[PDB]
Write a protein that binds this ligand. Structure first.
Ligand SMILES: OC[C@H]1O[C@@H](O)[C@H](O)[C@@H](O)[C@@H]1O[C@@H]1O[C@H](CO[C@H]2OC[C@@H](O)[C@H](O)[C@H]2O)[C@@H](O)[C@H](O)[C@H]1O
Ligand code: NA
Length: 707
């Protein structure tokens, strides 16, 4: 019923795997940690998202922990889907397609996977037997090795593979939490097999400092450690093999967090020989770096690519060898990058290169992943610097992977301003063209953003600064609609940045609630702060859009509604229960004052449905099964109530909805193919009737219009 379009950013997240199909030129796939999988469509020159049909119940399948194609069947595609292994996350599943991801069938697995956990960029854990495509293997993170003999429709544990093989296959992430990393890859040795019969020789890499490489000679019936293997580091990839030489990348951690050592090994099983072939050595002192990935040219078995990982001396490098590891050349330092597709990438640095792949039909064409998208070479074989430099382009059309944290559609200015994880955000001058990030000071996360209802040129945002060590001020304000920004003169005396921020209708007052700090009021952008009187620290404050004297608050811990009529100096408890907010990416109360009427507020919560607060009264407008995220925009007809938009569950069905009768009746405006999991930050456009924006937890921002 609506047409949904991506807000153009360009990648923006960590692509954890890339894969060419050797049976068809121009066919490739990508997997991501938070945002599903993609098929490169040579005819449209774009990546096509393959898992937007995931509904709200299946948000955890957006993390793609592994993927595989059948070398003998260009139509087959297999995804190992599962994002977290913690208690609130469901079991994993193999999604199988026999039309390149157009449709999927689902095999539920009895264990969980780690699509957005440590080791997510190790691969590939899922593999198809290259001589009998009926057979697949899947390495789990904490449940051993699993096998299918019916093209992934049913799975059973490989009883002969010991669970103890995964001993020590855990690690701490950046915030201290232990995670099950388990198996890093499963590799068939195709040279060992013949068409029609299961491949006899199979390698299994385990992300552990103990024995990390296992091999079977009898199609998985028995298992042994590979003789002579190095120990103490964790393998992440195993490539090559067709000429009898295998290439394995190692780090001192599973990745992507915290790598500070590693190695690159060449393994020649016929000679029982192991040779360290790392392009550059580890530092004698100070932090080292890992080898994030290795790949072999499908047409040229002695041609290798290998990436450093978390090299900060000075930055990461990608190396090429054409003689099996004997000599290497650096690639990126002398290369040219085209940022015209995503201008903001000119200020990014290639990093987190945990996956590489070379086009099996054109050795000139190689992909490497970063923590912000894919780069693609044009002339990897043919370049000669400086007159003919290696050329990289941002092959990311159709691929959108940001996790927005807040969205703003102001009464004037750009139609959308975003607050995004990792890359701060944008003033979206054009929704269909990628932009530069906000001018002025640079935040890590953009967490909260707001604009004055009656003076929309005044914008404020807050967020994080990763590895903050120089007292960076984490709230910023603009007076020209987000074109230029200035930091607040100080932070309030309590809290740790981020949180939620709001600005009154005439731009004279800002209320900022830093993380764990409670609410603080300023009338001079942080020159001075006062604690807001009469609110618990867990309250979130929103401004009226019309009357600068009016503000509102919902205590997230209790669901109680508070009200201010003194420009947010103080708040009274209204006596009214509006419900606690749905847990989302950022648990935030859904309180939306009427852009056109002072003192009219629309609210939503899972517990109470959709409500209107006006004239000291709460009216329940409707009671959907779960009202999660509420937005307000221009009425479709003049004189009619403002349009309301809802992401949630109505009559057992999840989706995104619009009400035209003031929130009493809802109509579904997306369809099952465009559910994107659990959309949030539903945001109307006060200037465009029918327009709605919403965030997704790894597929970026979308906007829709009727028809
Ligand atoms: O700015 C890019 C890169 O800089 C490194 O110095 C930093 O350590 C790294 O986090 C950054 O890479 C991004 O990391 C985030 C996830 O960040 C979180 O997990 C890893 C920790 O190292 C971080 O401290 C923590 O904030 C990814 O979402 C991005 O895709 C990736 O670019
Ligand atoms: Na906001």
């Amino acid at each position: 019923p609506y047409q949904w379009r991506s807000v153009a950013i360009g990648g923006g997240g960590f692509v954890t795997g890339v894969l060419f199909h050797p049976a068809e030129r121009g066919l490739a796939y990508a997997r991501t940690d938070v945002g599903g999988a993609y098929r490169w469509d040579a005819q449209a020159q774009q990546w096509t998202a393959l898992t937007d049909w995931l509904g709200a119940d299946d948000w955890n399948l957006m993390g793609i922990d592994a993927f595989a194609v059948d070398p003998a069947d260009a139509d087959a595609l297999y995804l190992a889907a599962g994002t977290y292994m913690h208690e609130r996350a469901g079991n994993a599943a193999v999604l199988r397609s026999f039309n390149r991801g157009r449709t999927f069938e689902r095999a539920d697995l009895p264990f969980k996977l780690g699509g957005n956990q440590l080791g997510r960029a190790n691969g590939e854990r899922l593999a198809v037997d290259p001589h009998d495509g009926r057979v697949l293997l899947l390495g789990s993170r904490d449940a051993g090795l699993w096998r299918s003999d019916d093209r992934g429709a049913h799975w059973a544990k490989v009883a002969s593979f010991p669970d103890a093989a995964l001993a020590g296959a855990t690690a701490r992430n950046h915030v201290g939490r232990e995670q099950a990393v388990g198996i890093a890859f499963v590799v068939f040795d195709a040279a060992s097999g013949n068409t029609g019969t299961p491949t006899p020789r199979i390698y299994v890499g385990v992300s552990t400092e103990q024995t990390s490489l296992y091999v079977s000679e009898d199609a998985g019936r028995s298992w042994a450690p590979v003789a002579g293997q190095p120990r103490g580091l964790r393998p992440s990839h195993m490539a090559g093999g067709s000429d009898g030489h295998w290439y394995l990348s190692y780090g001192d951690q599973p990745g992507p967090d915290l790598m500070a050592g590693g190695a690159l090994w060449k393994f020649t099983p016929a000679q029982g020989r192991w040779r360290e072939i790392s392009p550059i050595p580890q530092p004698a002192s100070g932090d080292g770096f890992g080898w994030g990935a290795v790949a072999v040219d499908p047409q040229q078995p002695q041609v290798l690519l290998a990436s450093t990982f978390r090299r900060r001396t000075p930055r990461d490098e990608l190396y090429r060898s054409v003689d099996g590891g004997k000599h290497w050349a650096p690639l990126l330092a002398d290369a040219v990058f085209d940022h015209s597709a995503a201008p903001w990438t000119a200020h990014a640095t290639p990093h987190w290169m945990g996956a590489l792949a070379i086009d099996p039909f054109d050795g000139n064409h190689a992909l490497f992943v970063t923590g912000y998208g894919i780069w693609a070479s044009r002339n990897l074989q043919d370049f000669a610097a400086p007159q003919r430099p290696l050329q990289w382009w941002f092959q990311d059309r159709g691929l959108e992977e940001t996790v927005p944290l807040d969205l703003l559609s102001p009464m004037a200015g750009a139609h959308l301003l975003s607050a995004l994880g990792d890359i701060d955000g944008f003033r979206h001058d054009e929704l269909d063209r990628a932009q530069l990030q906000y001018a002025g000071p640079r935040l890590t996360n953009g967490e909260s953003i707001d604009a004055a209802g009656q003076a929309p040129q005044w914008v404020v945002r807050s967020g994080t600064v990763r590895d903050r060590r120089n007292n960076e001020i984490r709230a910023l304000y603009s007076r020209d609609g987000g074109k230029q920004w200035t930091a607040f003169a100080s932070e309030p005396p309590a809290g740790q940045g981020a949180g939620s921020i709001a600005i009154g209708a005439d731009a004279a007052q800002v209320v900022w609630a830093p993380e764990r700090g409670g609410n603080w009021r300023t009338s001079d952008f942080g020159a001075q702060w006062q604690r807001v009187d009469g609110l618990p620290d867990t309250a979130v404050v929103m401004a009226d859009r019309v009357d600068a004297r009016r503000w509102y608050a919902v205590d997230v811990a209790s669901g109680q509604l508070y009200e201010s009529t003194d420009a947010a100096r103080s708040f009274r408890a209204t006596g009214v229960q509006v419900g606690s907010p749905a847990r989302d990416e950022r648990t935030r109360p859904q309180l939306r004052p009427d852009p056109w009427r002072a003192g009219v507020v629309y609210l939503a919560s899972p517990g109470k449905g959709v409500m209107r607060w006006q004239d000291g009264t709460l009216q329940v407008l409707s009671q959907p099964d779960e009202a999660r995220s509420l937005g307000i925009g221009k009425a479709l007809r003049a004189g009619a109530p403002p349009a309301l938009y809802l992401a949630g569950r109505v009559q057992g069905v999840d989706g995104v909805f619009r009400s035209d009768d003031g929130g009493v009746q809802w109509q579904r405006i997306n369809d099952d193919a465009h559910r994107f999991g659990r959309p949030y930050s539903v945001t109307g456009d006060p200037r465009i009737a029918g327009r709605v924006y919403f965030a997704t937890g790894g597929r970026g921002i979308f906007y829709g219009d009727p028809r």
